[PDB]
Amino acid sequence: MRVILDGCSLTPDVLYALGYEKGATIEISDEAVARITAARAVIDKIVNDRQTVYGINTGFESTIIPPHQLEELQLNLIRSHSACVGEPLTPERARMMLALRVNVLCKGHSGIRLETVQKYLKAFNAGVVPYIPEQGTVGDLGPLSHLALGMLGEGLLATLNNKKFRDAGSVLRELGVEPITLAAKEGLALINGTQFISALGAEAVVRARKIARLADVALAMSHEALRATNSTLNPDIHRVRPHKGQQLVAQRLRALLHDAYSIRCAPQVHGISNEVIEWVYGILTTELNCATDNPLVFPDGVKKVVSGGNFHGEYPAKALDMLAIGVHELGNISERRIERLNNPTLSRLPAFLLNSGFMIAHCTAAALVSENKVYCHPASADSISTSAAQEDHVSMGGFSARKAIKVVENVERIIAIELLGACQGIDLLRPLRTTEPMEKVWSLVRSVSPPWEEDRVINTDIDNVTKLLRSGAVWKTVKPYVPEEARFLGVLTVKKPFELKSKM
Amino acid sequence: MRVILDGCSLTPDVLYALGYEKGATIEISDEAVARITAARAVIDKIVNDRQTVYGINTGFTIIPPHQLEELQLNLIRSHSACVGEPLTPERARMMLALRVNVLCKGHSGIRLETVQKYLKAFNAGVVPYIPEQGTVGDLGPLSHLALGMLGEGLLATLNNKKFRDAGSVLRELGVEPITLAAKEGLALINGTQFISALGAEAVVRARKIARLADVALAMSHEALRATNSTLNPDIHRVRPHKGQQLVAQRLRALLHQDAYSIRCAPQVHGISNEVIEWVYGILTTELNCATDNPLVFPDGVKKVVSGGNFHGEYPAKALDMLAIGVHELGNISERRIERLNNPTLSRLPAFLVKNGGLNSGFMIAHCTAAALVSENKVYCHPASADSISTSAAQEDHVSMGGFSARKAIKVVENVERIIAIELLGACQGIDLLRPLRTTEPMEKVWSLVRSVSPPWEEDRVINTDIDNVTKLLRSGAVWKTVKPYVPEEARFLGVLTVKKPFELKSKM
Amino acid sequence: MRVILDGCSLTPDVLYALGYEKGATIEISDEAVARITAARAVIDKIVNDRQTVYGINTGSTIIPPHQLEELQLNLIRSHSACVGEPLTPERARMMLALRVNVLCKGHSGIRLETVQKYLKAFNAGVVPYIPEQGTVGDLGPLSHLALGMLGEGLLATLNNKKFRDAGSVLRELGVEPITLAAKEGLALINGTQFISALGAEAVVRARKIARLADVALAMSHEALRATNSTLNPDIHRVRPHKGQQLVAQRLRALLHQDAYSIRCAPQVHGISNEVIEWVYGILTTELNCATDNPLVFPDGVKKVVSGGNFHGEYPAKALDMLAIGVHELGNISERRIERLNNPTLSRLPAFLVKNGGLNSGFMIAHCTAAALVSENKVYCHPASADSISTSAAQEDHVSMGGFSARKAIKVVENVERIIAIELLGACQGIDLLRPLRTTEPMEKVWSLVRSVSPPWEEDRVINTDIDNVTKLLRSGAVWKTVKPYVPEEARFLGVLTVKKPFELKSKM
Amino acid sequence: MRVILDGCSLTPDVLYALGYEKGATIEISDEAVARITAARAVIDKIVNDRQTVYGINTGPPHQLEELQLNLIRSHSACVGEPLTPERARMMLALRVNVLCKGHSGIRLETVQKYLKAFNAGVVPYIPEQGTVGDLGPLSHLALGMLGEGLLATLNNKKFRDAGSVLRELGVEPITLAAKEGLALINGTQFISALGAEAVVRARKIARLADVALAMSHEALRATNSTLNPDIHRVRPHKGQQLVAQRLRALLHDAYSIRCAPQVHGISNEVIEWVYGILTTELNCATDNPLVFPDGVKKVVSGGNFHGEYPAKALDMLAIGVHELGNISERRIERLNNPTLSRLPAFLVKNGGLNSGFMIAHCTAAALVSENKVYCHPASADSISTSAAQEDHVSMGGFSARKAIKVVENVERIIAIELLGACQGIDLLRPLRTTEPMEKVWSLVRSVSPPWEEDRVINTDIDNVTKLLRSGAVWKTVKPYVPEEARFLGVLTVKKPFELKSKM
């Protein structure tokens, strides 16, 4: 897989693939190359003409810095801003941030040199693993500086073939990549932006979209195991409560299948979760293709170098706080259906499906839902300002992105527990059969987890079914039975950006 | 203003007007009347043919006629279980009008005469007694509404808002109490109208304060003597979120390196605007939804269908997110208030008062703003994230959106005061900069503020000024002043027209 | 009816009584009078000798006599910056009395005459106008208090609670308005008395509902016909938390495997009790603290000292934790309510009603309880965890405990209703079990409940019963009924006497 | 480092040492042995006499054994990352201590095997998510002792086959008789062991917070006026007075400095209170049903397994510890602010080319901000998982974990303040501070050189954090501080509360 970046076409799903698919590689388009060199020409003219421009050849102090002191300034910037702490990002997430960094630079408004972008490109393709401590950003100078630090051959680096973090200098020699060198503005160009929040957010919303579909598969199985009626899927019901999500979820369920609230009101609950995920997906897709640099370089603009606030991460921060809340509800209602499966008076099945069955598995699901409620608190609602700097308002979206991933990770396990329990319900109902797509899912689950005869170590089954869900095999199985519109695919193509009806 | 309801055309702004504008009246369309009687014909046939249908003439087996009526009354009474302070007259009447609108869709099976009575009571000026706590998302609130319509419990009127005997109040409006036939009990109390009516007020107030936030910001921008550099349309063209671009255009209209609270304002106000716009869309759909159960479809394959449209997760979730979005407007505004009071940051006299030896100026007003932001952070916790299964039976998941709606209103109420404090402080900044002038629209806003709050010479009781400027903002006079200077698209008006509902491409 | 304040002996329960009991009056002790005049002598010397001391006659520069009086007035007026609904008369007057108590410690430098006028205003029945929002933790609220004492802004009286001109109200009461000398402005508005007065009500109500929670539980225990096995003192001897042991003993006194909401009740109520007891101790100290600045020490090495005793983090933190502790009482109670309504869990008629084919019983009452628990979870978020600083001042860290105090009261108010719903439901259970009888104290409670709420024969408006039983609980009649059956130590009375303050072992 | 457990004497600090100090070993007292065998005699008598008692021989001798195994296996339902070796072994030791009270009905042989496994260096595999408050975690512990699932060792921490690890360690797997299954997995030991680490770390960072504050106080050249004992005598909270005395010991006007005793104080008191709750909890009989050989009823069903007590305490610990970081971050802000510090902006001379500690403050602010989310009480929620019995749970598993996270975050914040304040001292040379603070400064300078030109600052932050956690900083100032202000009272177990009345 070789992806061509141009700063306009990147989707969260492609970025996720860039981080997680073996053999992923990036290149930049010819039009991106043209934009980058055009922007750099502006910078080179300002520096050569010894013209004073804040952010270009000024200090920290609107006076002109001498050339040699200007190179040293870039290095001091990268080093002093490498202030992050805690556990480093996983190799996949660190490399997602790297690729996203390159994509944003492709818009050609940072003033970066082409050769610096190439060294970033070459490092990615060679399999570099940046060392990015996950805590520090207030929304992403820190994370992006740690990225640039490794590209300077300083600090720590790893590789895909050897993920033990070691001397960055030796790793670059290992990969045959010459370290970057920094000219004017290159220091800021590399570390200004929302790429830590947005890369992590990209993974979150991708995983969220996929678990939203899978939640309906688990629900369908529970529906069958509990022997519920199809009455609540009547399209007349959802025609008169015509939210997009609710209608789409009901159609998805009808494809798979053609009571209690956790089943009967599922379209009315999954629906809004789906719409939140779809909305967040749109916000993030725009953000992955934004020029978050400062100051901005516009070679064809009335002003060639402009100071703005595009580095502020409130947009993806807010979106990720809401993603967590939306995804959380999928697990919340799922846990209740798990409760019905284990309850003998509710299921008309053997209790918990001298044996305890899936009793404690429901417990695990409830614990995950409970901790998700804490993670539902909006991190971006807080701002802590540095008084005598310029930064008097920040997004605090670093934690928004991380806890969004955690909530989805938790909900994935919850859905796995429901699906696992519901499949056992199907066993208990034999020789009864369910629908063709659901029988295929059941067989798929049974290929990694045998039916529950005697008690056994159940965390193994939970983890196996979770692996199964994350593999994509479950959705791939039911996919051809579902109408195209109900497959959650519309967000996979980049829409044209909003345009003012007046350019005033 | 006489509004004709038809269950398809109601917007949050019209509903807000129905509750808050003097002389508001409702009627229902001819097509709504037709739908209502058509649905009732289904119910009447079922009852007369003595056919067993769950939710129509069953029980808690077919219940005989003389007791089917008693069942309706028992339902209304036993479900009137709400506690706490009653809704304000305006909000109670908003819930009443919204109730009527939903019934106009013609899927509840309600009788026409009952709707007519709900209709007549509203127009006569009835004030329902609706305790604000109880719903898990809205049997309770809607039952209290129906209870008063039965002439039981408490009622008030617009002319006399002291809650008294409901029977005498109906006798005061010359209104005859409702009577309940089969299904009418459920038809009146099934739905999300408590959450959605309160939510309607919230999102309307939110939309208006979002616009006003940019006016306060513009004034602060002028008082702080900031550059227009960050409003360069090239900046927002390459970070092209709809909200960010629209906010920047709105600011360019009012004002035709700085701190982040000013420079990153389009990047912060923008997402707030988009959240508000999104919530507005969710709620507009919800105001025109058939949230009844069981549903009656006279032209359907099944005439009576059990579903889950009463579940309030949709408006509950939207209102939790509205609170978070609106909160940020106050959050960044408070920081700009901080800059205005800070002599190092403002290049103005400290706390916007000259002769600051004996005076404190707007020092403690900033304090009040900070306290409001701080408490908004607690209200930012999503209430709909919780569910307490009220039965090991069938009601095993609920939205808990009652508190989502109420705290959404509280956050917007708080943010309105914050924006008022910023605008008040920024206008004093303008005074301190005289004989300098600002733009034509901002000079008009300044004059408008000065007509309710004089400049700050010596110290005086400042909570009076804060409240006055807050009243000014809520009056609509401030936006009305700058409105003609702003491009139509940047006026936050697109949400005022009801879009056609989403339609499935496939027939599966 | 007459409490003598001395700045050392005030308990939350006495302060609550001062605000809520009819005919309450305050006086100050002789030792307090002596301390006040001694401290004022220090101030008068400083001013007379024209000596420069920050906070007494500075700005910063030594302020001349004429301007020094004007400075006090400007201070009070400009700091009256609070917004929102005013405190209830009882809470406003609690803040007033607490203000006087703190001044009795004699470290504020206040004049005696000023204290006397506050004192006379309280006894005459003044109702201060104190907007509940604004403090960051309490210049605003305390300034609004002083503003009314100046005869400015709004005031009310106990005989006429309509807020009107403060000047006319003081004339009505026969109280001459205060006048302000040096330091008197700061002396009146420095302190944590808004947070602490509201907190005093909260922890008092919390302590009383903690006891009542065990009474409701005991009734539920009987209605559900549970075993006494889990009350075995051996169980709690080996899990010997003070609260758990005390709760179990209280339950044994009223009742002289099972579900967790009953069986683990000592293990859950226990920690709630201990949190309440801990908070009570924190607040009792705080009610008797010198929160002034700068502090005046007539017998100290330094007579006038600048410190940070005005910072409200201590009561703010305590009230955030009170909310969490009280919340759990309602949380576990709601689960017992669920068991009462559940036919498979209770072995009683579903929703505690016979002939439930037309009746719903207490079904929706459980719903109301669940909604209250759910909203309490939002209020459980610690408000004091946030701080918003004013960058260029000296106030770079604040407690934000104003909202901590208010939401603490809200949580307890909610939990009171929950306990009422449980008790109401459990008493119906007792009816359903007749001719069976329960214990002597529980039969008395049942009779007491039946005197305000008849048994549930047919369905009726249930919010009336809920409110009546809530009124009953708050009246104190329920606890008074079982009180003589409970061992003294299990009556939650230890906190009612002021303990000697902690003393350092070392002189360092 | 051989600790003798008896179910009555364990403190959070000793338990922490048991998990983190090399060569730690446990034994049980003779009285504990006596109690265990006495309780087991009750259980043996019941099964021998074929008497029906719920929780002993309920739901034949043959299958009663199978029931125990099914119990352990089916309840091993936890997910996520496993506990660190130190925390897993803390849970193991705490498990043994609770069994020493002699009310579980466990066999002595089983305890000795747990005992032996610990001393041999076993590392249990305990997934950190699942408990609703701790059947899951305790079952995973027992699963490994059965030689099933995964295990590791201190010498080889790669999780592998539990059977082979026990062979490696020379430990024969446990066997389960009647009641032994429940005896091993009933309790609050996952919450309490994690909570023990949290409150220990909290107590130590509370002391260190005053050291950082003292240095900031010196770097900012503040007055000692706010430490006047008369101030705190008239606002006589225990914590506030103790903190002020601690500061006076180290030092013999902005709110973040002036109101520090009034803010650190309540944090200290919360930590001290939580410490007391947890100390009791470490020595509680959380079994069910309970066995009382000398009781009126020998086997009693109760609710001592309910973890609300430690859950609530840990939710409050997080809130209390959080505030230390909150006010510290504000002092960090003052250090970097040239208008507030009267020092070079961001503590760097020649700031035209250098940024100094600017972004380090940024890191501190981010940590405070995320701590605000963790301040939400996890124990405030309950999800009834049983339509009947288990209808209220504590949800204290996450309370314990996020408590550790908050303290971990605050440790870094304090490190950043101390690091910045020491640079302030450098900028003020040839000025000197007090003798104990000069020693702390020298100690910091031994792991982090002064800031001349810009360099990679996350290295310095991590080094100073390591320094704080090492105990060397407190050990340095310890002899200058009055005994009462050293936060040591909680280190000795107080006698348990006793009812006055016999009712």
Whether A387 and C386 lie within 8 Å, measured CB to CB: no
| Residue of chain C whose alpha carbon sits nearest to that of A392 | C391
DSSP class of residue D297 equals S
How many degrees, rounded to 5, is the angle at CA B286 between CA B285 and CA B291?
130
Tell whether B179 and B213 lie within a shared domain: no
Residues of D in contact with B377 (CB under 8 A): 372
The alpha carbon of B70 is separated from its chain's Cα centroid by a whole number of angstroms, namely 36
Q: Six-digit token pair at B247? A: 């906010």
Shortest alpha-carbon distance between residue B381 and chain C (Å)? 6
CATH number for the domain that contains residue D35:
1.10.275.10
Length, in residues, of chain D:
503
Whether D482 and C505 lie within 8 Å, measured CB to CB: yes
Name every residue whose Cβ is closer than 8 Å to that of residue B377 and which is 6 or more positions away in sequence: A381, A382, B327, C381, C386, D372
Taking CA atoms, B323 is separated from A318, B268, B330, B362, in Å, by 12, 15, 11, 27
Shortest alpha-carbon distance between residue B332 and chain D (Å)? 16
Q: What are phi and psi of C95, to 5 degrees?
A: -65, -35
Question: How many whole angstroms separate alpha carbon A356 and alpha carbon A361?
Answer: 10
Tell whether A326 and A462 lie within a shared domain: yes
Q: Which amino acid is at A12?
A: P
> Could you tell me which of C384, C394, C383, C403 has the C-alpha nearest to residue C134?
C403
Known catalytic residues of A are 54
- CB pairs B-D closer than 8 Å: 7
Helical packing angle, C402-433 and C313-341, nearest 10°: 20
> In chain A, what's the furthest Cα-to-Cα distance?
86
Known catalytic residues of C are 54
Taking CA atoms, D183 is separated from B209, C230, D40, in Å, by 61, 18, 11
Whether C139 and B83 lie within 8 Å, measured CB to CB: no
Name every residue whose Cβ is closer than 8 Å to that of residue B17 and which is 6 or more positions away in sequence: B1, B3, B24
Name every residue whose Cβ is closer than 8 Å to that of residue B49 and which is 6 or more positions away in sequence: none
Nearest by CB: D501 against C105, C249, C502: C249
Q: To probe the interface with D, which of B388, B396, B400 has the most D CB atoms within 10 Å?
A: B388
The burial class, CB within 10 Å (0-12 / 13-18 / 19+), for B152 is buried
Question: How many whole angstroms separate alpha carbon D265 and alpha carbon B184?
Answer: 62
Q: Is B10 left (phi over 0), alpha (psi -120 to 50) or beta?
A: beta
Question: How many whole angstroms separate alpha carbon A219 and alpha carbon C25?
Answer: 65
Q: In this structure, how many other beta carbons lie within 10 angstroms of the beta carbon of residue B478?
A: 24
| Residue of chain C whose alpha carbon sits nearest to that of B417 | C83
3-state secondary structure B290-351: CCCCCEECCCCCCCEECCCCCCCHHHHHHHHHHHHHHHHHHHHHHHHHHHHHCHHHHCCCHH
Q: Six-digit token pair at D145? A: 């002792």
> In chain C, what's the furthest Cα-to-Cα distance?
88
Name every residue whose Cβ is closer than 8 Å to that of residue A143 and which is 6 or more positions away in sequence: A84, A89, A97, A132, A133, A136, A137, A195, A196, A398
Question: How many whole angstroms separate alpha carbon B239 and alpha carbon A296?
Answer: 11
Contact A226, A425 (CB under 8 A): yes
Give the long-range contacts of residues B163-167, CB within 8 A, separation 24 or more.
B163/B86, B163/B127, B163/B129, B166/B129
In this structure, is residue D502 part of a structural domain? no
Strands D122-124 and D25-28 turn out to be: unpaired
3-class DSSP state of C14: helix
Q: Six-digit token pair at C52? A: 């420069």
CB-facing half-sphere around the CA of B494: CA atoms within 13 A = 15
Contact A427, A451 (CB under 8 A): yes
Question: How many whole angstroms separate alpha carbon C4 and alpha carbon C18?
Answer: 11
Question: How many whole angstroms separate alpha carbon A263 and alpha carbon B306?
Answer: 12
Instruction: Report chain C residues touching chain A, CB-CB < 8 A.
Output: 344, 377, 381, 386, 389, 391-392
> Hey, which residues does B165 pair with through a beta bridge?
B154
Give residue for tokens 């002109």: A64
Shortest alpha-carbon distance between residue B391 and chain D (Å)? 9
Name every residue whose Cβ is closer than 8 Å to that of residue A423 and which is 6 or more positions away in sequence: A221, A225, A441, A442, A445, A446, A449
Shortest alpha-carbon distance between residue C76 and chain B (Å)? 8
Tell whether D199 and D346 lie within a shared domain: yes
Q: Six-digit token pair at D123? A: 């590392």
Question: How many whole angstroms separate alpha carbon B82 and alpha carbon B75?
Answer: 14
* CA dihedral sign, ordered B217, B220, B224, B227: positive
Question: How many whole angstroms separate alpha carbon B109 and alpha carbon B95?
Answer: 19
Question: How many whole angstroms separate alpha carbon B351 and alpha carbon B428?
Answer: 10
Nearest by CB: D387 against B344, B386, B392: B392
Q: What are phi and psi of B131, to 5 degrees?
A: -60, 135
Whether C267 and D308 lie within 8 Å, measured CB to CB: yes
Contact B144, B152 (CB under 8 A): no
Q: What are phi and psi of B198, to 5 degrees?
A: -65, -40
In this structure, is residue D501 part of a structural domain? no
Question: How many whole angstroms separate alpha carbon C253 and alpha carbon C257?
Answer: 22
Whether B344 and A388 lie within 8 Å, measured CB to CB: yes
In this structure, is residue D159 part of a structural domain? yes
In this structure, is residue C266 part of a structural domain? yes
Q: Is the peptide bond before D449 cis (omega within 30 degrees of 0)?
A: no
C167 sits in which H/E element: helix C166-173
Whether B328 and A314 lie within 8 Å, measured CB to CB: yes
The burial class, CB within 10 Å (0-12 / 13-18 / 19+), for C41 is middle
Last residue of a domain, one of A157, A192, A227: A192
CATH number for the domain that contains residue C411:
1.20.200.10
How many degrees, rounded to 5, is the angle at CA B176 between CA B170 and CA B177?
80
Question: How many whole angstroms separate alpha carbon D413 and alpha carbon D415?
Answer: 5
Q: In this structure, how many other beta carbons lie within 10 angstroms of the beta carbon of residue D434?
A: 16
Name every residue whose Cβ is closer than 8 Å to that of residue A453 and which is 6 or more positions away in sequence: none
> Hey, which residues does A133 pair with through a beta bridge?
A88
Whether C267 and D303 lie within 8 Å, measured CB to CB: yes
Q: Six-digit token pair at C106? A: 């004699």
Catalytic-labelled residue, pool D16, D20, D54, D114: D54
Tell whether D167 and D213 lie within a shared domain: no
Q: In this structure, how many other beta carbons lie within 10 angstroms of the beta carbon of residue D38?
A: 14
Beta strands per DSSP E along C351-491: none
Q: To probe the interface with A, which of D64, D79, D327, D389 has the most A CB atoms within 10 Å?
A: D79
Contact D407, D321 (CB under 8 A): yes
> Could you tell me which of B451, B456, B463 has the C-alpha nearest to residue B420?
B463
Contact A171, A253 (CB under 8 A): no
Nearest by CB: C391 against A373, A377, A387: A387
> Could you tell me which of A206, A341, C305 has the C-alpha nearest to residue A214?
A206
Q: Six-digit token pair at A200? A: 């992590």
> Could you tell me which of A486, A38, A67, A70 has the C-alpha nearest to residue A300?
A38
Tell whether B333 and B293 lie within a shared domain: yes
Give the long-range contacts of residues B471-474, CB within 8 A, separation 24 or more.
B472/B420, B472/B448, B473/B209, B473/B212, B473/B416, B473/B419, B473/B420, B473/B423, B474/B416
Contact D150, D159 (CB under 8 A): yes
Question: How many whole angstroms separate alpha carbon A327 and alpha carbon A211?
Answer: 9
In this structure, is residue D272 part of a structural domain? yes
In this structure, is residue D335 part of a structural domain? yes
What radius of gyration do chain C's Cα atoms show?
Answer: 26
Q: What are phi and psi of C456, to 5 degrees?
A: -90, 90
Q: Which domain holds residue B67?
A: 2-190
Tell whether B22 and B87 lie within a shared domain: yes
Q: To probe the interface with C, which of B155, B346, B388, B411 has the most C CB atoms within 10 Å?
A: B388
Taking CA atoms, B167 is separated from B81, B128, B171, in Å, by 20, 12, 6
How many degrees, rounded to 5, is the angle at CA A467 between CA A462 and CA A472?
130
Question: How many whole angstroms separate alpha carbon B57 and alpha carbon B38?
Answer: 18
Question: Which of D300-322 are b and which e, b meaning 16 or more Cβ less than 10 Å from the residue's Cβ?
Answer: bbbbbbbbbbbbbbbbbbbbbbb
3-state secondary structure D225-260: HHHCHHHHHCCCCHHHHHHHHHHHHHCCCCHHHHCH
Last residue of a domain, one of D186, D204, D226: D186
Question: How many whole angstroms separate alpha carbon D420 and alpha carbon D333?
Answer: 10
Q: Which amino acid is at B469?
A: V
3-class DSSP state of B179: coil
Name every residue whose Cβ is closer than 8 Å to that of residue D452 and which is 6 or more positions away in sequence: none
Last residue of a domain, one of B190, B217, B235: B190
Q: What are phi and psi of C163, to 5 degrees?
A: -65, 125
> Could you tell me which of B107, A447, A459 has the C-alpha nearest to residue D131?
A459
Nearest by CB: B344 against D339, D384, D387: D339
Tell whether A329 and A367 lie within a shared domain: yes
Helical packing angle, A195-225 and A141-151, nearest 10°: 110
Tell whether A26 and A117 lie within a shared domain: yes
Contact C136, C400 (CB under 8 A): yes
Q: To probe the interface with D, which of C235, C292, C372 has the most D CB atoms within 10 Å?
A: C235
Give residue for tokens 């240095």: D215
Beta strands per DSSP E along B194-315: 295-296, 304-305
Q: After which residues is chain C broken (C to N over 2.5 A)?
A: 59, 137, 256
Q: In this structure, how many other beta carbons lie within 10 angstroms of the beta carbon of residue B225?
A: 13
Report the Cα–Cα distance between both ends of chain B, in Å, rounded: 43
Strands A156-159 and C131-133 turn out to be: unpaired
* CA dihedral sign, ordered D399, D401, D405, D408: positive
In this structure, is residue B500 part of a structural domain? no
The burial class, CB within 10 Å (0-12 / 13-18 / 19+), for D435 is exposed
Name every residue whose Cβ is closer than 8 Å to that of residue C479 and which is 6 or more positions away in sequence: C208, C211, C212, C215
Contact A377, D373 (CB under 8 A): yes
The alpha carbon of A114 is separated from its chain's Cα centroid by a whole number of angstroms, namely 28
Q: Six-digit token pair at D275? A: 């410490």
D73 sits in which H/E element: helix D61-74
| Residue of chain D whose alpha carbon sits nearest to that of A74 | D353
Q: Six-digit token pair at B182? A: 């089969």
Contact B334, B322 (CB under 8 A): no
Residues of A in contact with B393 (CB under 8 A): 260
Question: How many whole angstroms separate alpha carbon C145 and alpha carbon C154?
Answer: 10
3-class DSSP state of D403: helix
Question: How many whole angstroms separate alpha carbon A393 and alpha carbon B448?
Answer: 29
Tell whether D209 and D178 lie within a shared domain: no
Question: How many whole angstroms separate alpha carbon B327 and alpha carbon B335?
Answer: 13
Contact D100, D6 (CB under 8 A): yes
Shortest alpha-carbon distance between residue D407 and chain A (Å)? 13
Contact A175, A127 (CB under 8 A): yes
Q: How many domains does chain B have?
A: 2
Whether B78 and C460 lie within 8 Å, measured CB to CB: yes
CB-facing half-sphere around the CA of D380: CA atoms within 13 A = 29
Alpha-carbon dihedral of residues A372, A377, A380, A381, nearest 10 degrees?
Answer: 180
Whether C386 and A382 lie within 8 Å, measured CB to CB: yes
Question: Which of B179-192 are b and which e, b meaning 16 or more Cβ less than 10 Å from the residue's Cβ?
Answer: ebbbbbbbbbbbbb
Q: Which amino acid is at C380?
A: C
Residues of C in contact with A371 (CB under 8 A): none
Question: How many whole angstroms separate alpha carbon D12 and alpha carbon C271?
Answer: 19
Q: Which amino acid is at B197?
A: A
Question: Which of C334-348 are b and which e, b meaning 16 or more Cβ less than 10 Å from the residue's Cβ?
Answer: bbbbbbbbbeebbeb
Question: How many whole angstroms separate alpha carbon A271 and alpha carbon B318?
Answer: 12
C27 sits in which H/E element: strand C25-28
Give residue for tokens 């209170």: D273
| Residue of chain B whose alpha carbon sits nearest to that of D369 | B377
Contact D403, D198 (CB under 8 A): yes
DSSP secondary structure string for all residues of A460-494: HHHHHHHHHHHHTHHHHHHGGGS-GGGGS-GGGSP
> Could you tell me which of B142, B139, B170, B165 has the C-alpha nearest to residue B153?
B165
Shortest alpha-carbon distance between residue C129 and chain B (Å)? 12
Tell whether A154 and A275 lie within a shared domain: no
Neighbours of chain B (3+ CB pairs under 8 A): A, C, D
In this structure, is residue A333 part of a structural domain? yes
CB-facing half-sphere around the CA of A187: CA atoms within 13 A = 23
Q: Which amino acid is at B253?
A: A
Length, in residues, of chain C:
508
Q: Six-digit token pair at A440? A: 């295929």
> Hey, which residues does B83 pair with through a beta bridge?
B133
> Could you tell me which of B337, B338, B297, B286 has the C-alpha nearest to residue B469?
B337
Taking CA atoms, C441 is separated from B110, C219, C421, C449, C484, in Å, by 50, 10, 19, 13, 9
Tell whether A326 and A360 lie within a shared domain: yes
Whether B308 and A265 lie within 8 Å, measured CB to CB: yes
Length, in residues, of chain B:
508
Whether C381 and A377 lie within 8 Å, measured CB to CB: yes
Tell whether A122 and A255 lie within a shared domain: no
D125 is catalytic: no
> Could you tell me which of A28, A139, A147 has the C-alpha nearest to residue A78?
A147
The alpha carbon of B82 is separated from its chain's Cα centroid by a whole number of angstroms, namely 21
> Could you tell me which of B346, B283, B292 has the C-alpha nearest to residue B320?
B283
